[PDB]
Amino acid sequence: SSVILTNYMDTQYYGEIGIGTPPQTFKVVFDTGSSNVWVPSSKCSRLYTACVYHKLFDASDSSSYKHNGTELTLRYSTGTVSGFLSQDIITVGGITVTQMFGEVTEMPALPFMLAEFDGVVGMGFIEQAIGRVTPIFDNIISQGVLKEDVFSFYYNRDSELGGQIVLGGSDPQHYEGNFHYINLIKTGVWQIQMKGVSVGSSTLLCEDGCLALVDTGASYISGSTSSIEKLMEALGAKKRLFDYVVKCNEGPTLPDISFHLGGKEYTLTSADYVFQESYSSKKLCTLAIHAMDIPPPTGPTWALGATFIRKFYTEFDRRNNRIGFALAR
Amino acid sequence: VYIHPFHLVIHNESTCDPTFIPAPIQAKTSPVNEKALQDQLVLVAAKLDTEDKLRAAMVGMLANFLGFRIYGMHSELWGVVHGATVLSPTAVFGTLASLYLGALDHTADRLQAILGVPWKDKNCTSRLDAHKVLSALQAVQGLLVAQGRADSQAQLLLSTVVGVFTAPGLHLKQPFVQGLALYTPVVLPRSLDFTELDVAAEKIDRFMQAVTGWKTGCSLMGASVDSTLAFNTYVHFQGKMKGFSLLAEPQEFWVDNSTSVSVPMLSGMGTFQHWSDIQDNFSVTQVPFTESACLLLIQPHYASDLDKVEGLTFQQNSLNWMKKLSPRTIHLTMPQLVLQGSYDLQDLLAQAELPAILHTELNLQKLSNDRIRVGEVLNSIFFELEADEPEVLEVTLNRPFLFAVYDQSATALHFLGRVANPL
């Protein structure tokens, strides 16, 4: 089974899921960095403008809904949502599963007013699930219908298909060459060992090793504040409040950035990480690499998001606790 | 410009009085030294961290989204018919954020959402909640009236004086007033007898116009007799445009195809940025104030249906992302704008947020020692535009149009308004 994804400005990749009977449709991001499912709730005060601007789940319109009511708060890197748990049937890519998910009643304008999607579907392990709620992928596996306990992500370039998730395998149509796997450091987290990060000609980063969280829900490739400062200084980039910029005319001149993973070098060109909006020296162009301090126990750690996945088709293998990469087609 | 990354990396949750009665307005209060004010605001803008600049931008966007939220009235905003049809998202947000100071659980927890909360997505209680937002919103004013690379007199002015008129024997608390001080220097709490609304309304105008020095579009309009508090923000915008001149001969305008109006003008010669969307039939030119600040003039291509087109000038992320930066030689021509404008926030907000009910609710405390029953929470603006002496595009605004001044440095639009006819 595959899920068709929409690509919004190269920063938000989302697909549709249906909740309830009759189905209530929601745009959601599939995030390997978290493990809970959530959508905005009809019980969310309209004082939260983000709730006024998104699809709201109304339990009183679903005959398959099952009440629970346990309170839950979900804390992400860029924001927080709070609400309560509910159960209902969820349709995802043709598969139907009963699932416990969050009905959000508090959703801050910043950053959710800037969200194209309505909610999130955690693709992480149950070990990171808040409130110990069984993750949707564990529930699907329990049905014993998938041919493989693995799911794969394909994120297309902005263009204007936006992207695609395959539940149960991989799509040969969107990758070439063969996969090269890296074993997970531990079950419970889609995190892997990274042997090093090189910029141009000088592996001046992640010497002695570091961690890499393969995060489909992250728009960019991120590193700790210290690591990014070095990487950026090397790039000649200036720091701003929420990102790093470079004078556009110099975007094409930026060096390659490479990521040593499992005995293979994954290299990005400047075209791969800079939002080349123009070429003027009087304009600033943002970079798809940010500074993000991810808290323990998962962090500190680098995060390989869309910027990376766009270049490399990614397969998450639950049966063998490994992650595979292959050149995206 | 332009994108916004989403960081969806789950983690293990983390985080982190002496009251006084104000004097009567009969007391001789000296007027606001407007030079002294802006020279203090530029210092606040100057002595400001790089982190604070992001906060000023952030609180700017919250003010933007609140303004777009408020268009949930669906073309009834101008229905609040007092003076010229123009509202200040930044002033609205601020006046609303200042009431948040005087708010306990529930009431603060409503305004949190209504104002646009929680800036941080949490209420660990600190100097940011109410105190951070207010002083951040002070910053955004200094960011507008900047002239960083200009150095010399930028010619744009933004005054914001907050009147807080309590009833007799209402001992309003100190730390609340220091909170208001963070939002604006000119905080003028002064008592008044609200039992006589006629006598209060006429004196409240006589006080402010004396203190401020600009005619505000009435005051204490639609305020109940059995009231105490009257939290009124007063803003005044000066906007001088170089390369412009006032015409002795009026070009006249048509508010509709049939009727005509004798009205002034402002001719403009210069190569500005402008790009017309042919999808929804659009066209917008500008006349920047040091780039930082920019007056965007939204022209409806056909100009037949504004209500539909103008709707796309309060439309969430689109109005801001309208930023192709395509330069062109344009002959600017627009009416001379010098109009007041009042609007009560409790009439301005309703149903979706229904604060009118929440305002007359008991829970305030942090402001209110005694019983508070608000008569009006007014935002009054005095928008003013001025001039300082091979091929082209003759962009005239002969029929009604839309506009909005926007700050790039604080990513915040200070004003948005419609022009039917000057009167």
Domains of chain A, with CATH numbers? 7-146 (2.40.70.10), 147-329 (2.40.70.10)
Task: Give the closest residue to A279 by CA, choosing from A306, A249, A256.
Answer: A249
Same domain, B231 and B250: no
Cα separation of A245 and A283, whole Å?
10
What count of other Cβ atoms lies within 10 Å of the Cβ of residue B34?
A: 17
B288 lies in some domain:
yes
Task: Give the closest residue to B90 by CA, choosing from B46, B136, B128, B49.
Answer: B136
Quick check: is A215 catalytic?
A: yes
Q: Please name the residue ranges forming H helices in A53-183.
A: 109-112, 136-141
Same domain, B184 and B293: no
Cα separation of A108 and A113, whole Å?
8
Cα separation of B183 and B133, whole Å?
8
- Report in angstroms the alpha-carbon separations of B147 from B8, B45, B142, B153, B235: 38, 11, 10, 7, 20
Q: Do A35 and B10 touch (CB under 8 A)?
A: yes
Cα separation of B380 and A284, whole Å?
38
For residue B174, give its domain range: 34-239+339-384
B402 lies in some domain:
yes
Q: Please name the residue ranges forming H helices in A268-311.
A: 270-273, 306-309
Q: Is A111 on the interface with B (CB under 8 A)?
A: yes
B328 lies in some domain:
yes
Q: Which residues of B touch A76 (CB under 8 A)?
A: 7-11
Q: Do B12 and A294 touch (CB under 8 A)?
A: no
B20 lies in some domain:
no
Same domain, B79 and B118: yes
Residue A13 β-bridge partners:
A7
Same domain, B176 and B82: yes
CATH number at residue B101: 3.30.497.10
Tokens 């006819």 locate to B421
Q: Compute the radius of gyration of chain B from its Cα atoms.
A: 22
Here the tokens at position A96 are: 């139907």
DSSP H or E segment with residue A165: strand A163-167
Here the tokens at position A263 are: 């005995």
Same domain, B61 and B208: yes
List the resolution, Å. 4.3
Same domain, B151 and B283: no
A275: nearest CB among B3, B13, B72? B3
B8 lies in some domain:
no
B213 lies in some domain:
yes
Tokens 């930082």 locate to B292
Which residues lie closer than 8 Å to B253 by C-beta, 6 or more apart? Answer: B260, B261, B263, B335, B397, B398, B399, B421, B422
B410: amino acid identity, one letter: A
B8: amino acid identity, one letter: L
* Residues of chain B with a CB closer than 8 angstroms to some CB in chain A: 1-14, 50-51, 53-54, 57-58, 61-62, 65-66, 68-69, 72, 110-114, 116-119, 121-122, 316-317, 352-353
Q: Rounding to the nearest 10 degrees, give the CA dihedral for residues B421, B411, B68, B309.
A: 50
CATH number at residue B292: 2.30.39.10
A90: amino acid identity, one letter: I
B203 lies in some domain:
yes
Q: Is A88 on the interface with B (CB under 8 A)?
A: no
Pair A131, A70: CB distance under 8 Å: yes
Cα separation of A322 and A57, whole Å?
35
Same domain, B229 and B125: yes
Task: Give the closest residue to B228 by CA, choosing from B278, B194, B265, B263.
Answer: B194
Same domain, B192 and B44: yes
Same domain, B147 and B69: yes
Cα separation of A152 and A167, whole Å?
7
Give the number of domains in chain B: 2
Here the tokens at position B106 are: 């529930």
Cα separation of B20 and B177, whole Å?
10
Quick check: is A317 catalytic?
A: no
Q: Which residues of A touch B8 (CB under 8 A)?
A: 29, 31, 33-34, 76-78, 120, 215, 217-218
Q: Which residues of A touch B61 (CB under 8 A)?
A: 110
B268 lies in some domain:
yes
- Report in angstroms the alpha-carbon separations of B31 from A190, B178, B188: 64, 21, 11
* Residue A133 main-chain phi, psi, to 5 deg: -90, 130
Tokens 């914001």 locate to B160
Same domain, B233 and B260: no
Tokens 């010229």 locate to B84
DSSP designation for A203: -
Here the tokens at position A86 are: 């509910």
Long-range contacts from A190-194, C-beta under 8 angstroms, 24+ separation = A190/A32, A190/A33, A190/A123, A190/A124, A190/A125, A190/A214, A190/A215, A190/A316, A190/A323, A191/A298, A191/A301, A192/A261, A192/A262, A192/A323, A193/A261, A193/A262, A194/A259, A194/A260, A194/A261, A194/A302
Same domain, B307 and B349: no
Same domain, B298 and B214: no
Catalytic residue among A10, A88, A118, A215: A215
Which residues lie closer than 8 Å to B227 by C-beta, 6 or more apart? Answer: B167, B194, B373, B374, B375
Task: Give the closest residue to B194 by CA, choosing from B173, B161, B219.
Answer: B219
- Report in angstroms the alpha-carbon separations of B281 from A211, B286, B325, B417: 51, 18, 18, 20
**Buried/exposed code over A30-69 (b: 16+ C-beta within 10 A; e: otherwise):** bbbbbbbbbbbbebbbbbbbbbbbbbbbebeebeebeeee
